[PDB]
Amino acid sequence: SMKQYVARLEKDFSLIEHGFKEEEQRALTDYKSNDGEYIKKLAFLAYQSDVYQVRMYAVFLFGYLSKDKEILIFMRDEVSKDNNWRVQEVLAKAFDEFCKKIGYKKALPIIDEWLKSSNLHTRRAATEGLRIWTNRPYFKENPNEAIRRIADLKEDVSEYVRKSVGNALRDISKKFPDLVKIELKNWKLESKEINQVYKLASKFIDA
Ligand SMILES: [Cl-]
Ligand code: NA
């Protein structure tokens, strides 16, 4: 039964102290081996586990299932409430999986929606999940479309978000240093928040 399978996952995954590949691989196999109706039921049951590793497994399933708007909304609104930081990392990966499946250019309205969400975890999942942004389709040929979107969050009230924003710009600066330099030149570094983001973003820029 489904309940018995979740119990097995709890026994097996609770031993895993680091990483995410074991949970990811199992989620992928299960997603590919069963019809969507079944796997959606399993993902919701697994996500209620008190074992965070099993919730990680469930959020990978959500990512594979995320063409279903109901699943994507649950990711946006409910998984974003998870108190476990490792689950939050998987949320970022599952969002990236959504974007990859529908296509990054086609995903832009959703990316913009998540970046403007009220939940800081929703904003961070988008910023972090797409790193390195300019390695992704669309953004790799249009790097300012990534830089501008990330830089919009440079005054975010959340330090969690700001660290992701600064790091995401930092990523891009390693392959497009002039474009990041050009973006940063306009910043008025007056707040504690923007200076934190600037310090992360500008490490490899000859400003
Ligand atoms: Cl990457
Ligand atoms: Na990553």
Residue numbers in the entry: 0 to 206
Paper quotes:
The HEAT-like repeat (HLR) DNA glycosylases exist in all domains of life and are structurally and mechanistically distinct from their base-flipping counterparts. These enzymes are composed of tandem helical HLR units that form an overall solenoid shape with a concave, positively charged DNA binding surface, and represent the first example of such an architecture to support DNA binding or catalytic activity. Here, we describe a new family of proteins related to the HLR DNA glycosylases that lacks DNA binding specificity as well as alkylpurine excision activity. We identified a fifth family, which we designate AlkD2, not present in B. cereus but spread across phylogenetically diverse bacteria, commonly in species which also possess AlkD.
